Ligand binder design. Structure first.
Ligand SMILES: *[C@@H]1O[C@H](CO)[C@@H](O)[C@H](O)[C@H]1NC(C)=O
Ligand code: NA
Lengths: 252, 25, 36
């Protein structure tokens, strides 16, 4: 996260760290959506152009964390993956269309002050909040600058950007399964996701019921915090019927 | 106040690859 | 069915459940109030 700040303790209790077993390295962010289900970006698990192609046993997840590196005694919990589900129409060859994946934990994780699931948006929540200029919040342990790793989880608040401005900012084909967020050059403020933040959540707090909702997944960007560029995010609501199909068919 | 993303659902029924863009992440 | 998800989702133990605000959530709320 570029131009953010340290998260507060307990600020993002749905935050999940995706950790590669061998060689050991932080792969991506992710989010907890129930005691058994973790949501991430498909490209964190499958992206052949960068030689990424992970199965359930290649990875583990760490939940409840704040420090990037320190073992957090009686706070963090490690979990194994029983199954990975990548969107069957995820477009890794081109533009990361449908950049979404679910991971089923082998054992349910116990909730705590530091571990708690985020909500997925209903239709009214999505309509009321997915508006240009409305701010969401991005969290992760990714790089602090484009060219530099944080000691603790970082947080930044960023406004959703009008779709034509998103499209003008990039040579990539932007689909209805993506939105972009970030400050414009004239706005002064800065901030972006960066390498290592992929797969983490873009969340918004409903002023109607006080709950945090996951509206986006950190998907891709051209650099980090560049003037005239914006971070792109998976449009979670638009893919929610797939999420619910996976949980209806394979959840318990 | 303008929609940032459409309120509908992805259903069944191409350009530059992301990896070709300098600085892509 | 998963449906709405956890009945308790999105309410943080150390914030909403204690009636405590985090350091920047006000910035989000203010951005959800429209102009004229
Ligand atoms: C990922 O790896 C599996 C097992 O090696 C292979 O069968 C599959 O074709 C790979 N997927 C892609 C998209 O390369
Ligand atoms: Na920018």
């Amino acid at each position: 996260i570029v131009e953010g700040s340290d998260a507060e303790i307990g600020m993002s209790p749905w935050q999940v760290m995706l950790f590669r077993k061998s060689p050991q390295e932080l792969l991506c962010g992710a989010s907890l959506i129930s005691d058994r289900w973790v949501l991430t970006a498909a490209h964190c698990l499958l992206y052949p152009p960068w030689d990424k192609n992970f199965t359930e046993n290649d990875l583990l997840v760490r939940i409840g964390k704040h420090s990037r590196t320190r073992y957090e005694r009686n706070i963090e919990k490690i979990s194994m993956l029983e199954k990975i589900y990548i969107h069957p129409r995820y477009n890794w060859r081109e533009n990361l269309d449908r950049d979404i994946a679910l991971m089923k934990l082998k054992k349910p994780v116990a909730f705590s002050d530091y571990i708690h699931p985020v909500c997925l948006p209903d239709r009214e929540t999505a309509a009321s909040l997915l508006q240009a200029g409305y701010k969401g919040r991005v969290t992760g342990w990714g790089n602090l600058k484009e060219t530099g790793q944080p000691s603790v989880l970082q947080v930044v608040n960023l406004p959703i950007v009008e779709r034509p401005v998103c499209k003008d900012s990039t040579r990539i084909r932007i689909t209805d399964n993506m939105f972009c967020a970030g400050y414009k050059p004239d706005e002064g403020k800065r901030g972006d996701a960066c390498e290592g933040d992929s797969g983490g959540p873009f969340v918004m707090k409903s002023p109607f019921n006080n709950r945090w909702y996951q509206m986006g997944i950190v998907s891709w960007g051209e650099g980090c915090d560049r003037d005239g560029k914006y971070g792109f995010y998976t449009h979670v609501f638009r893919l929610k019927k797939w999420i619910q199909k996976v949980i209806d068919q394979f959840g318990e | 106040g303008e929609p940032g993303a459409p309120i509908d659902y992805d259903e069944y029924g191409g350009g530059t690859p992301l990896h070709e863009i300098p600085g892509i992440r | 069915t998963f449906g709405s998800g956890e009945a308790d989702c999105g309410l943080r133990p150390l914030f909403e459940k204690k009636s405590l605000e985090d350091k920047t959530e006000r910035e989000l709320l203010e951005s959800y109030i429209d102009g004229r």
